Amino acid sequence: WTATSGSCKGRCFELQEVGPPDCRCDNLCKSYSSCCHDFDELCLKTARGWECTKDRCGEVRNEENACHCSEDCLSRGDCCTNYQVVCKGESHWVDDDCEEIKVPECPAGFVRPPLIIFSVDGFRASYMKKGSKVMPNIEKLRSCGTHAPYMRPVYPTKTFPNLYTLATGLYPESHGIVGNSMYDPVFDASFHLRGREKFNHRWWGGQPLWITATKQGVRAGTFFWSVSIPHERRILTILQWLSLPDNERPSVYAFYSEQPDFSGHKYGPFGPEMTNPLREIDKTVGQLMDGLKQLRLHRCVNVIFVGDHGMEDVTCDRTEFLSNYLTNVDDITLVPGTLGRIRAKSINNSKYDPKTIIAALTCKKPDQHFKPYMKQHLPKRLHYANNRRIEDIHLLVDRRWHVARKPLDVYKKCFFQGDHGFDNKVNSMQTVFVGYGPTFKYRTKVPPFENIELYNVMCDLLGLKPAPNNGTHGSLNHLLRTNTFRPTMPDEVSRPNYPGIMYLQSEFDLGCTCDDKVENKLEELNKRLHTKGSTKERHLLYGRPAVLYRTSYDILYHTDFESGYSEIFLMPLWTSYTISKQAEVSSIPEHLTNCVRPDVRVSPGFSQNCLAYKNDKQMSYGFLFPPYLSSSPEAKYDAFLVTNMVPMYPAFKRVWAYFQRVLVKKYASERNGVNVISGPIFDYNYDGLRDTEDEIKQYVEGSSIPVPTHYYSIITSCLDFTQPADKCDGPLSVSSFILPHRPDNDESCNSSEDESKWVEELMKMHTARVRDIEHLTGLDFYRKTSRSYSEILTLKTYLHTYESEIGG
Ligand SMILES: *[C@@H]1O[C@H](CO)[C@@H](O[C@@H]2O[C@H](CO)[C@@H](O[C@@H]3O[C@H](CO[C@H]4O[C@H](CO[C@H]5O[C@H](CO)[C@@H](O)[C@H](O)[C@@H]5O)[C@@H](O)[C@H](O[C@H]5O[C@H](CO)[C@@H](O)[C@H](O)[C@@H]5O[C@H]5O[C@H](CO)[C@@H](O)[C@H](O)[C@@H]5O)[C@@H]4O)[C@@H](O)[C@H](O[C@H]4O[C@H](CO)[C@@H](O)[C@H](O)[C@@H]4O[C@H]4O[C@H](CO)[C@@H](O)[C@H](O)[C@@H]4O)[C@@H]3O)[C@H](O)[C@H]2NC(C)=O)[C@H](O)[C@H]1NC(C)=O
Ligand SMILES: O=C(/C=C/c1ccc(OC(F)(F)F)cc1)N1C[C@@H]2[C@H](C1)[C@H]1CN(C(=O)c3ccc4[nH]nnc4c3)C[C@@H]21
Ligand SMILES: [Ca+2]
Ligand SMILES: [Cl-]
Ligand SMILES: [Cl-]
Ligand SMILES: [Cl-]
Ligand SMILES: [Cl-]
Numbered sequence: 001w002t003a004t005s006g007s008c009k010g011r012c013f014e015l016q017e018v019g020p021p022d023c024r025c026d027n028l029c030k031s032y033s034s035c036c037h038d039f040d041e042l043c044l045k046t047a048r049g050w051e052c053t054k055d056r057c058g059e060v061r062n063e064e065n066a067c068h069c070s071e072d073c074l075s076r077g078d079c080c081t082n083y084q085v086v087c088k089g090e091s092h093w094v095d096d097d098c099e100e101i102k103v104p105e106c107p108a109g110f111v112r113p114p115l116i117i118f119s120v121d122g123f124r125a126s127y128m129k130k131g132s133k134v135m136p137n138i139e140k141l142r143s144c145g146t147h148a149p150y151m152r153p154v155y156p157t158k159t160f161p162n163l164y165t166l167a168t169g170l171y172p173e174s175h176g177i178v179g180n181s182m183y184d185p186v187f188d189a190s191f192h193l194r195g196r197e198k199f200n201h202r203w204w205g206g207q208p209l210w211i212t213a214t215k216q217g218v219r220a221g222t223f224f225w226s227v228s229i230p231h232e233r234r235i236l237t238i239l240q241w242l243s244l245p246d247n248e249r250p251s252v253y254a255f256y257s258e259q260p261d262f263s264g265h266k267y268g269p270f271g272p273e274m275t276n277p278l279r280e281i282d283k284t285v286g287q288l289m290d291g292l293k294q295l296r297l298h299r300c301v302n303v304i305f306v307g308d309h310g311m312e313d314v315t316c317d318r319t320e321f322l323s324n325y326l327t328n329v330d331d332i333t334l335v336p337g338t339l340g341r342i343r344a345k346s347i348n349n350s351k352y353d354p355k356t357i358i359a360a361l362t363c364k365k366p367d368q369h370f371k372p373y374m375k376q377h378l379p380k381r382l383h384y385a386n387n388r389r390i391e392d393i394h395l396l397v398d399r400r401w402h403v404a405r406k407p408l409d410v411y412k413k414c415f416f417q418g419d420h421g422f423d424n425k426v427n428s429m430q431t432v433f434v435g436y437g438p439t440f441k442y443r444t445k446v447p448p449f450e451n452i453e454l455y456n457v458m459c460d461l462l463g464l465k466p467a468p469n470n471g472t473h474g475s476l477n478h479l480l481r482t483n484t485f486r487p488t489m490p491d492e493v494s495r496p497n498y499p500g501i502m503y504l505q506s507e508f509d510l511g512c513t514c515d516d517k518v519e520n521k522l523e524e525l526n527k528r529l530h531t532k533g534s535t536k537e538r539h540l541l542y543g544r545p546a547v548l549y550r551t552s553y554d555i556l557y558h559t560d561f562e563s564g565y566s567e568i569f570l571m572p573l574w575t576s577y578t579i580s581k582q583a584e585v586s587s588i589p590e591h592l593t594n595c596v597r598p599d600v601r602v603s604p605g606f607s608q609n610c611l612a613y614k615n616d617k618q619m620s621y622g623f624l625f626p627p628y629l630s631s632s633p634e635a636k637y638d639a640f641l642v643t644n645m646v647p648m649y650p651a652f653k654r655v656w657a658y659f660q661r662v663l664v665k666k667y668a669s670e671r672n673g674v675n676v677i678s679g680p681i682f683d684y685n686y687d688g689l690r691d692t693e694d695e696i697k698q699y700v701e702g703s704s705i706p707v708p709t710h711y712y713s714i715i716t717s718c719l720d721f722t723q724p725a726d727k728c729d730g731p732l733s734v735s736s737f738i739l740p741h742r743p744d745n746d747e748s749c750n751s752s753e754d755e756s757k758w759v760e761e762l763m764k765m766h767t768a769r770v771r772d773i774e775h776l777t778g779l780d781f782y783r784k785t786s787r788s789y790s791e792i793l794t795l796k797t798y799l800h801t802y803e804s805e806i807g808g
Pocket of ligand 2: 117119121159160163164166167168180193209223224225226227254255256261262
């Protein structure tokens with residue numbers, strides 16, 4: 001109930017909100033149906049259009065007009081955006097040559113450059129090149145300012161998850177908006193697009209930019225706009241707000257366009273009907289810039305042109321139905337579309353079992369266009385598991401396809417040619433970024449980046465201190481003319497020990513055997529140097545990783561590799577080695593197949609044993625540095641130390657073996673040497689962060705040897721591949737993965753075939769940022785390079801996507 005008896009006269013688009021049952025006049029009261037009776041009349045005027053014609057010049061101020069062409073409108077801050085052009089012989093912003101904005105050129109009373117966020121829904125990255133003919137304002141913006149070829153959205157590539165990620169720097173799993181539709185069991189409540197629960201505050205976590213701004217005494221415009229408010233009225237309001245006195249004037253503003261997403265759903269991404277909405281976005285941009293120019297603010301304001309996600313070609317005839325797979329289709333709830341999430345329909349049903357559900361959905365058709373997953377087994381680069389609103393079962397859907405429950409849901413609930421929500425590395429889902437203004441760089445292209453990083457930047461452009469988020473502060477300083485934030489290396493928490501030979505072979509009772517009792521100042525003093533760390537300059541190219549938590553561990557040196565061995569987890573945390581282009585792959589000699597040697601540098605108490613693996617019929621073992629890449633028959637024995645050993649399921653050994661035997665060598669041939677860093681990851685609560693010892697849910701049977709949920713590798717080389725990895729002078733190039741350590745290969749439908757047909761594709765699916773591995777391990781890589789720490793932060797946020805070029 002609202003007593004809408006009050007007025008909006010003098011209060012059109014007020015910046016603060018008033019609590020019920022007074023009537024509101026803000027740009028959102030329509031969605032609440034609590035506007036004052038006179039809102040439309042006074043605030044939403046439309047008379048005479050949005051443009052000054054040649055006969056409106058110097059008119060008598062008629063208050064009924066949407067905008068004004070009178071003499072006093074510059075003073076009132078309510079002219080039409082084309083006023084100066086038509087009535088004063090000025091030119092449009094777009095028709096001017098772009099001159100570099102070396103310093104902010106602001107009017108007195110402006111204490112900082114304002115920030116304007118122009119967000120465009122569904123605006124696919126390829127539109128920047130492909131529609132460039134019909135978007136002249138956006139093209140001037142793009143090419144005079146700072147831009148990226150694309151910006152990666154978060155998963156799911158839906159509207160609300162991405163808009164709220166843009167505002168918070170958080171993953172949807174952390175901000176809580178994990179889709180366009182959600183169920184929260186703790187609340188016992190649901191979240192819809194069509195409804196009024198979505199307005200309730202409990203859904204929305206994190207600290208969005210406008211709240212961060214408010215709490216630090218920077219004033220914000222109100223970011224959201226009722227759908228019925230036309231885009232022209234949205235621009236003029238922003239401009240009016242900018243005309244306000246210094247003490248009332250916000251420092252940050254937002255504009256939202258429902259286009260091109262709206263038309264994109266109807267006509268597909270490249271529908272001939274798409275040119276017009278794109279024409280109309282550009283005109284709105286024109287309107288804004290012409291408006292800023294009138295205010296003399298076009299060389300003072302920072303403008304961000306950002307999309308939320310792309311748009312893919314999708315039709316009704318590309319739907320997969322769960323009813324063609326399952327028996328009890330009426331005992332499941334499905335959230336459908338471009339992703340799927342499944343739960344029990346009634347919780348008082350105890351004959352519901354997700355494992356049977358998943359099995360019924362696994363490679364059951366040769367053509368299958370979706371893949372079932374328990375959420376914790378989703379790839380880690382999606383960060384889509386640590387929220388109670390995320391269903392245990394998740395279907396990842398092929399681009400261009402839908403999943404539904406029964407055919408009756410698709411025709412009675414085609415009409416659409418476009419959709420989004422797919423895996424965020426999919427090309428059709430990438431969006432745009434362009435930054436324009438005094439604080440952004442001039443004519444600069446920057447590499448692609450993820451939208452999680454923007455919150456920090458917008459905080460910088462405003463002199464704000466960002467709330468704790470998932471961005472990597474300083475990773476986007478290279479977009480900026482001037483920073484404000486200078487990132488600093490975290491301090492190492494745990495210092496390593498450097499253990500020597502302390503123990504005799506016979507002290508070890510590990511139940512391991514190795515036929516190694518066969519073997520001179522020449523090649524015996526030499527191996528002393530190796531165990532002390534003579535060859536470390538070759539295998540540890542960027543400094544040891546720093547341990548950022550409290551723990552006890554040892555650095556172990558070897559001819560071929562170096563490890564950070566954890567006395568707590570009974571295995572290395574990391575193992576580092578260099579494979580040059582000239583390196584050769586050997587095999588494991590026949591006699592040394594089952595060989596495991598005691599490490600006389602580490603006590604039997606802090607060692608694994610072979611007996612545990614013998615007794616654990618499910619579990620087996622592998623090695624972090626691969627025997628296959630030993631540089632000599634003598635060095636090969638180093639590879640068989642109990643301290644290079646890690647638990648592995650037989651099914652996973654097939655993946656690992658091929659990575660170590662085939663792919664490392666291949667990468668080294670292609671990239672001119674690689675440095676490899678590998679290790680275990682423990683994330684049993686699927687929060688993307690390292691488990692502590694007391695959070696391990698699985699041990700190798702009858703032992704205190706913890707089983708990793710994942711294994712990672714960081715593979716580094718020179719960006720200039722003419723230079724060998726171990727003599728790289730300039731920038732580095734990197735690719736990484738976090739492979740799930742699973743006891744079956746149910747994820748790979750071609751796994752009964754040869755490793756050469758499926759393994760590499762699995763790896764590509766679980767591509768990772770070096771930053772993802774940091775959070776999951778509590779380590780910090782690249783401590784000692786010749787590169788700037790800003791450059792290294794950018795390297796760490798790099799994701800290698802394996803998608804071909806944008807456009808082709
Ligand atoms: C991506 O970035 C984000 C953000 O940086 C990372 O997420 C952060 O991770 C931290 C560590 O995991 C975590 O610390 C927690 O905090 C717990 C309480 O946190 C509440 O307060 C948060 C702050 O709000 C304030 O914000 C500003 C400052 O920024 C202030 O000025 C304001 O005044 C605000 O008050 C708040 O954000 C958080 O909100 C969550 O819950 C809300 C419901 O109330 C949701 O609306 C909201 O969406 C958040 O929900 C998410 O996160 C929670 C985890 O908190 C999770 O449950 C959900 O799935 C969802 O994803 C809270 O309201 C606090 O309880 C923790 O302390 C425990 O652990 C320590 C360990 O040392 C114990 O010593 C301690 O005693 C305590 O344990 C107790 O409970 C145990 C069981 O849990 C029990 O066994 C034990 O015996 C004890 O009783 C800890 O400090 C941050 O909260 C979290 N922040 C966010 C925003 O998520 C994230 O890690 C990054 N991701 C990656 C991959 O890197
Ligand atoms: O005025 C705003 C947002 C302003 C904003 C400005 C900058 C921002 O970022 C920053 F924080 F960085 F500034 C963030 C937000 N709105 C009203 C609209 C919009 C959010 C949704 C789309 N929608 C669907 O109903 C909808 C739209 C497209 C869809 N595709 N598929 N389903 C769909 C559903 C209704 C909702
Ligand atoms: Ca964890
Ligand atoms: Cl959704
Ligand atoms: Cl297998
Ligand atoms: Cl620990
Ligand atoms: Cl594309």
